[PDB]
Structure 1
Amino acid sequence: AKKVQAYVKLQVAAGMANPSPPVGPALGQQGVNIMEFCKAFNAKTDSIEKGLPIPVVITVYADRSFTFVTKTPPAAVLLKKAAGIKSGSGKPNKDKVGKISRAQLQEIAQTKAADMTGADIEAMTRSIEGTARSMGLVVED
């Protein structure tokens, strides 16, 4: 495994193929072309889901293309369809926005265990629960 050469995690909704206003210059900053994030980008995206943001490693080399392994979609984008309210966050402590229980978030927690770091399921359970704590969703334990 090599050290920091030129890898950066950056791209909007994975369904949005070839983003120029959202990202544009950043993914085409290095020697890698703009076309690479379109054909090869939607190869792995179409398996899981579209209209969903998902990250990937961009370890650029002097050859032409780059090696990559995709990870997992982040916490609250998943807590849209799962949570209910589109507006995640607003004025929680002064005015509670929403609420989620342990049973849903504990079940949602373990599905990312390929990417997630922890000891037990109950360990990352209160983490990926906690991801709700911070959207004005004081966890219904």
Structure 2
Amino acid sequence: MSYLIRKAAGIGKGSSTPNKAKVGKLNWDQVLEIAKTKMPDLNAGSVEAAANTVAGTARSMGV
């Protein structure tokens, strides 16, 4: 899903030090299209159960 984030937020690369300097910030609207295209690749529950999954990745990516 990192590709989709590197496109939506327009990220050239990322961040070597996510603890110091970050990259950017998006919105939840750009997350709905992520849990809608990659459905079979997620066995979550409903709504929030799939909204907190992706948010996780982003958290350590630098968003």
TM-score (normalizing by structure 1): 0.39
Aligned residues: 63
Write out the 4+ residue segments of structure 1 that deviate beyond 6 Å after TM superposition. Answer: none
Distance in 1, Cα, partners of 2:28 & 2:53: 11
Q: Could you list the per-position Cα deviations for residues 31-88 of structure 1 after superposition, in whole angstroms to 9, with x for gaps in the alignment?
A: xxxxxxxxxxxxxxxxxxxxxxxxxxxxxxxxxxxxxxxxxxxx21222212311212
More helix by share: 2
Q: Which has the higher contact order (CA 8 A, sep 6+)?
A: 2
1:85 aligned onto 2:24: no
Q: Residues 111 and 121 from structure 1, CA distance in 2 versus in 1: closer, same or farther, beyond 3 angstroms? A: farther
Match of 1:112 among 38, 42, 48: 38
Partner of 1:126: 52
Instruction: Output the aligned Cα RMSD.
Output: 1.7
- Which runs of no fewer than 5 residues in structure 1 stay unpaired? 1-74
The answer to whether the 8 Å contact 2:15/2:22 transfers is no
- Which runs of no fewer than 5 residues in structure 2 stay unpaired? none
TM-score (normalizing by structure 2): 0.74
Alpha-carbon distance, 1:113 to partner: 0.8
CA radius of gyration, larger in? 1
- Tell me the percent identity: 49
